[PDB]
Design a protein around this ligand. Structure first.
Ligand SMILES: Nc1ncnc2c1ncn2[C@@H]1O[C@H](COP(=O)(O)OP(=O)(O)O)[C@@H](O)[C@H]1O
Ligand SMILES: [Mg+2]
Length: 773
């Protein structure tokens, strides 16, 4: 027999999924694949595994369902917390419940209900595709559309098909597999209507959760300093409004730690109270890297966007086209004071497990609970008693810049769907309030309706590399929920081959696996991997960071000081002396960063970035102004170098003991001559498919050229280019801003280019990196 406590079984009957047990189990008995949709707090994660367990799934001599019940989460916080909750709810059967969030954790013997991440199950499928240890797999939180979730759903479609075939043949020897996909929303047509996933559409069950009304309060304007605004709003809620918990939505650990410290200092418990160490978080993050667990966007610090208040405000100035703050008309109730202690706790994915469990316990009497969380608390779990939500409206998400191939992880607006999901957390126990730290205008105009599936926010070569690191062989025909185009997939496989991440039979190499460990686009990952020779790693880190952020050099044409037009075509129609003096100082400044190498634009980049570390704080602006630099880009490059250094150091160890890096660690020696030649080979490894040979070499005497041709007129041809019936439609040229223009000597024979550019219609121009010998 199974025996739960009175508290437990009475909590369960309130949950809307509990009431639909009948329809759910009926569908599961009649169908191998079932989709269940229900809002957060419905009881999906806690109750469906219990339904299966009570039905005999995993029972030690079940004739049809002896395998475990596996349930995946895209979020490891949810995996662990919801495992602990289900173990509690199973009473004297709770020992059957375990979890696994690390690759090399080996789970308990008697575990029959197993919570794990996405990536854990993907890895188990490498050793047993059929997942024979499992009677049922629940893919949870699918509406988040993380890349591993999409991949797992495709993999499981094949697995369930195969298990059904084998079970049809011999049911004593091969058991069926029940696949259940669970979603917070109805947006499941990429699963339910996808015929390559499910030839026969699975049933879609809807659970009708009862959410109390939540009053939505927009701020009048949208503050740039959202952490200060959230602190301010949280204090006002706490001091004026009746009992109930506060959930604050920030974007990452650093912000959360700082905000929790401010709140504890503002509303402490009495001096040397026991509670002022139940709140202590002596370890800000667990030792974690990509070798042991699947990094989530939230965990990765690699941001390339300039933060800038002026740019922010001008981007949203339409809100200035149209008195008290709304949502503060309720008052304190008896036994409350404006200065009650705040039982404030952090909640983010890097948080140690024992600390992350504190958020479900009741606050001590006479205090108010405040959870400062990332969007882990948006749909993946529920904090009891939340009456007030404070929404920064933002999150850290993966982004892919199509124009330059840079993958990064950036703070930006969430979708409207996500904002509404955040608000809803204030409506689980009773009517509540959500305080959005942004205007109704900004919400309307700049919050996208729906967030893009992560597969659409990735370099396709990253998608392919991840699947290949999971030993998924057939990429082209893989049943994606949202498939990339076959052409892009083929090109991505070929790129990974040029990078040596896939071999000639399209299988991952050892260097491929190492690259798959990095959160960067594979060209950059490759350059960092081959870089640990002759103390060259820091130079490559500087170069990758500069390329990721962008060109900090303001050029003559942007300064409006060019003597000759950018383009030679003769179309369209104080200041002079000053312009000539500006040109003088500009070419001097440029030359000052061109001393490491005479042919290589990438090394003038390295040069400014290196010089930047010797310019003390009070010189930055003078430095910037004197050198026509984009100071915000330079500062961002400093920050990114430090982030990337942390990423590498965290990867060297198995357990992360990487130390905070300080600005003084970036001080570089200027590279030696052989160091420079080597850097050129490393960069070339990242861009092997981008070499351009002077047309006069491949074809001498068959094409025009003269003694005094402008350098910018000297034709190059990318070796991998598609020769056309009329050839010259395919040549490319050196840009007039490059270092090469100051040669006079003839330009190199083999040049390495970052990319080619066609806007600016004279001719296709090269964005040059360096020469190849
Ligand atoms: N320690 C706990 N962990 C998780 N949920 C808890 C805990 N204690 C109580 N609960 C309650 O259990 C319910 C869990 O619902 P859940 O299964 O997470 O729904 P869904 O997965 O559909 O969002 C919540 O309403 C929450 O209030
Ligand atoms: Mg859930």
């Amino acid at each position: 027999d199974l025996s739960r406590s009175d508290e437990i079984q009475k909590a369960r009957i309130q949950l809307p999924v509990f009431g639909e047990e009948h329809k759910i189990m009926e569908a599961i008995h009649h169908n191998d694949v079932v989709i269940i949709c229900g809002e957060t707090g419905s009881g999906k994660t806690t109750q469906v595994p219990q339904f299966l367990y009570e039905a005999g799934f995993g029972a030690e001599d079940s004739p049809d369902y002896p395998g475990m019940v596996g349930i995946t989460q895209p979020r490891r916080v949810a995996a662990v917390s919801m495992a602990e909750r289900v173990a509690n709810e199973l009473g004297d059967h709770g020992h059957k419940v375990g979890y696994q969030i690390r690759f090399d954790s080996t789970a308990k013997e008697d575990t029959k209900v197993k919570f794990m991440t996405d990536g854990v199950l993907l890895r188990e499928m490498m050793h047993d595709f059929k997942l024979t240890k499992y009677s049922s797999i629940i893919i949870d939180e699918a509406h988040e559309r993380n890349i591993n979730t999409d991949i797992l759903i495709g993999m499981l479609s094949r697995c369930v098909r195969l298990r059904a075939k084998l079970h049809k043949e011999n049911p004593i020897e091969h058991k069926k597999l029940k696949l259940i996909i669970m979603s917070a929303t109805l947006r499941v047509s990429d699963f339910s209507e996808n015929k390559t996933l499910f030839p026969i559409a699975p049933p879609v069950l809807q659970v009708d959760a009862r959410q109390f009304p939540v009053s939505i309060h927009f701020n009048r304007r949208t503050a740039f300093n959202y952490t200060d605004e959230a602190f301010r709003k949280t204090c006002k809620i706490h001091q004026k409004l009746p009992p109930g918990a506060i959930l604050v939505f920030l974007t990452g650990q650093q912000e959360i730690t700082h905000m929790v410290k401010r709140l504890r200092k503002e509303f402490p418990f009495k001096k040397n109270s026991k509670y002022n160490k139940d709140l202590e978080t002596p370890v800000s993050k667990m030792g974690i890297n990509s070798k042991t667990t699947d990094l989530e966007a939230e965990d990765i610090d690699f941001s390339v966007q300039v933060i800038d208040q002026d740019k922010f405000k001008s981007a949203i100035r339409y809100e200035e086209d149209e008195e008290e703050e709304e949502g503060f008309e309720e008052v304190l109730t008896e036994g409350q004071t404006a200065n009650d202690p705040l039982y404030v706790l952090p909640l983010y994915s890097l948080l140690p497990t024992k600390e992350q469990m504190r958020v479900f316990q009741k606050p001590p009497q006479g205090s108010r609970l405040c959870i400062v969380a990332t969007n882990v608390a948006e749909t993946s779990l529920t904090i009891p008693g939340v009456r007030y939500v404070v929404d920064s409206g933002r999150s850290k998400e993966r982004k892919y810049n199509e124009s330059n191939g840079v993958q990064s992880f950036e703070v930006g607006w969430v979708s409207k769907a996500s904002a509404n999901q955040r608000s809803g957390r204030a409506g689980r126990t009773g009517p509540g309030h959500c305080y959005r730290l942004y205007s109704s205008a900004v919400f309307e105009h700049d919050f996208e309706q729906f967030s893009k599936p992560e597969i659409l926010r990735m370099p396709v070569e990253s998608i392919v590399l991840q699947m290949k690191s999971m030993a998924i062989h057939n990429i082209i025909n893989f049943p994606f929920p949202t498939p990339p185009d076959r052409v892009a997939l083929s090109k991505a496989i070929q790129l990974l081959q040029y990078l040596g991440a896939l071999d000639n039979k399209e299988m991952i190499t050892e260097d491929g696996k190492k690259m798959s460990l990095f959160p960067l686009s594979p060209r950059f990952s490759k350059m960092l991997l081959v870089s640990d020779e002759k103390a060259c790693l820091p130079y490559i880190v500087a170069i990758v960071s500069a390329l990721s952020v962008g060109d900090p050099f303001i050029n003559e044409f942007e300064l409006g000081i060019n003597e000759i037009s950018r383009k030679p075509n003769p179309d369209e129609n104080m200041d002079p002396e000053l312009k000539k003096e500006l040109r003088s100082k500009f070419y001097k400044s440029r030359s000052q960063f061109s001393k490491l190498d005479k042919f290589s634009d990438v090394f003038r980049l390295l040069s400014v970035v290196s010089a930047m570390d010797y310019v003390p704080k009070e010189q930055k602006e003078i430095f910037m102004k004197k050198n026509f630099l984009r100071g915000k880009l330079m500062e961002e490059i400093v920050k990114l170098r430090k982030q990337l250094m942390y990423i590498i150091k965290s990867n060297t160890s198995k357990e992360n003991i990487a130390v905070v890096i300080r600005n003084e660690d970036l001080k570089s020696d200027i590279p030696s001559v052989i160091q420079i030649k080597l850097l050129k080979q490393m960069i070339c490894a990242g861009f092997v498919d981008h070499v351009a040979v002077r047309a006069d070499v491949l074809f001498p005497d068959d094409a025009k050229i003269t003694n005094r041709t402008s350098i910018i007129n000297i034709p190059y041809i990318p070796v991998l280019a598609t020769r056309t019936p009329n050839i010259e439609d395919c040549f490319v040229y050196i840009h007039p801003t490059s270092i090469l223009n100051n040669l006079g000597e003839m330009p190199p024979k083999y040049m390495l280019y970052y990319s080619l550019h066609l806007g600016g219609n004279n001719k296709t121009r090269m964005n040059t990196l360096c020469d190849i010998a």
